[model samples]
Target: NLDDTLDVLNDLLQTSKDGEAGFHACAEDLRDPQLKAAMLEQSRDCAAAADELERIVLELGGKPEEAVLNECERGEDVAKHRYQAALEKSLPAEIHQVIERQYQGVLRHHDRVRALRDARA
Candidate 1:
């Protein structure tokens, strides 16, 4: 059970790292202050997640795989494609509503950022 858990966590760690890199890069290229801030915030979250996962992996006596580390670089791209696919397929309205509800705080933050930008302009 421990081994299985470690395997799954290692994969997640890689994926999170991928997200961090992508967000950081996207943030660099964005001129919109609101968007850039959001991306940086997300990148930080992913960085934390990856750090936690790595610690857990080490605690479990597992070495992180080099191949998986390499794969992590593409994780953000994969996530984007996956999200687009989900959108194209379209989740049920109730499913979408439930998920969106969970992200209300994040939504509020973006709204606040936009409002600040509007005030400045």
Candidate 2:
């Protein structure tokens, strides 16, 4: 059971790293100061999450896997899909809390980006 838990923790760590990379890209691409700031903040949030996950991995006697970074758009898409799929299964409370927060963050970012685009048009 610890092994399985480690596996999930590692996966989430990877996902958070992916998201951190994605938001950094978005921060680079966007011209709007507000949007760029938002992206950078989210990026920091993900990086912090990854750090926490890494600590947990070490505590569990597992080496943390390297970050598999993704570009902004595709990475967020994959993260959203991954979380949605995970929500369909039975999960521990801690894992579920992480997934729910990530899922909500993705949805919120999507809406913010869309609104920014619409306003720019």
Candidate 3:
């Protein structure tokens, strides 16, 4: 039924959105503009992936999740802030590479999510 479809899509959206938030955090915290751009570019890819999922869900008569909130450090803003803070608190700000690695990790997660969603098709 469409309701079931919606539920699945909603869950997918939540996971993707949370994943994007993590990437966003990395981008925001990066000191190097090039690094930030790279992260953001990867984030755009994520957003594209999320949009595709949303379209599929909505196409199947489901409602897409479209909300952004700023809660505790657990949320997007805090995630970015924490990344920034960690680098700042440390002696050197060489954590950009680490953040980049994490960024790839997030992208991988999204790919898996997409694959799972596709499997459901």
Candidate 4:
């Protein structure tokens, strides 16, 4: 299942990034020490994950997104601050869990991105 899903997901990520193929540019923009580290990690994860999905699309003769998608104008800047804000809004366990889960996704994405970059070079 993962083998098949990985392909579809990768393409989705590529398409999601849209024409912003050079996500590295975003990495360069990050100033927050923690956020910068997170961005580096996310970039690697997204890259590797996209590669897996892209392989499937290629095998099927489908063209995938060539560059990173500009889904939003702010990019990581928006994401970083949003999470920081969430972390600050202390809530009950239920709401806190929800925020925490989302925050963890951010963290995981960062981890993956960094790993992806390292693998490439």
Candidate 5:
């Protein structure tokens, strides 16, 4: 546990929570109900991901520290890559879906985020 795994999980948990908060804001701030729904769902998935990761953090006998997105599109890009790297690792398959599903949403939502904001701006 003295290695970087805990640190990685902690940082990832921070990212997950940040994404949840960001999506929540985006959903609330959005003009369209449909778009808002998408963001709200995204936020929920982020929360779920955080929950799963937090459990793993505690299981590894560690503390949750605040490490704590952006033009959230940029945040998504950051999140996307981190998720990418994480999924490619040797972690358990069970947790993969939790992380992978959220990453999939990020891939889908990021472009929409950019376009929606760009359209409005």
Candidate 6:
């Protein structure tokens, strides 16, 4: 149903926004040039993903939703889970393909952040 699809899109939109802001905030706190660039790039990636979801929501004939904040890696964690949850839903094949692709993107970013974090810790 489009109703359920809308809910998933909106929720994922919010999660992506959180990742966007979270990574931007993280970038702001950094001093290392490379690290700062990386975080900022991730921020842009999240923004792009959020915008994509926003377009999907509009295409589905629904209003997009707002966001909650995070530290980004945590936000990516949330984004990853939300994408997983969205994938678990019995969505239309076309929709599922897009969601799965986005989920892979989220997973890639999540793993990169995890590696960076682990390197620090």
Which of the numbered candidates is closest to the native, going by highest TM-score?
6
Judge candidate 4 at residue 120 and give its lDDT. Answer: 44
Instruction: Quote the lDDT for 86 in model 1.
Output: 33
Worst 10 residues of 1 by lDDT: 65-74
By lDDT: ranked, best first: 6, 5, 2, 1, 3, 4
How big is the positional error of residue 36 in model 6, measured in Å on the Cα after superposition? 2.5
TM-score on alpha carbons, each prediction: 0.55, 0.72, 0.43, 0.40, 0.71, 0.83
lDDT of 5 by residue, 44-74 (tens): 8788879888998898788880111235456
lDDT of 5 at 50: 90
User: Number of backbone collisions per candidate, in order?
Assistant: 0, 0, 0, 22, 0, 0
Query: Best to worst by TM-score, what's the order?
Result: 6, 2, 5, 1, 3, 4
lDDT of 1 by residue, 1-84 (tens): 566555555655676687778768767766667667866776786677677668767977989822332343244446444333
Candidate 3 accuracy as TM-score: 0.43
Residue-wise lDDT of candidate 2 within 22-72, one digit each (tens)? 788778877668768767877887898788778868987999700222245
| Predicted candidate 3 versus true structure: per-residue lDDT over 7-97, tens digit per residue | 5446545655765766577667765464455456555665765776577666667656111111212343333443344334322233335
The reply for model 3, stretches above 4 Å from the true place, is: 1-5, 32-35, 65-121
Runs with alpha carbons beyond 4 Å of true place in candidate 6: 65-71
Worst 10 residues of 2 by lDDT: 65-74
Residue runs of model 4 more than 4 Å from their true location after superposition: 1-13, 16-23, 65-107, 110-121
Local distance difference test values of all predictions, in order:
0.56, 0.71, 0.49, 0.48, 0.73, 0.75
**Most accurate candidate by lDDT:** 6
Better of 1 and 5 by lDDT: 5
List the candidate 5 regions with Cα displacement exceeding 4 Å: 65-70, 88-98, 111-121
Q: Is candidate 4 or candidate 6 better by lDDT?
A: 6
Per-residue C-alpha lDDT of model 6 across residues 36-118, encoded as one tens digit per residue: 77678778887888888888788879976012113445666777788888888998888888788888887777677566656
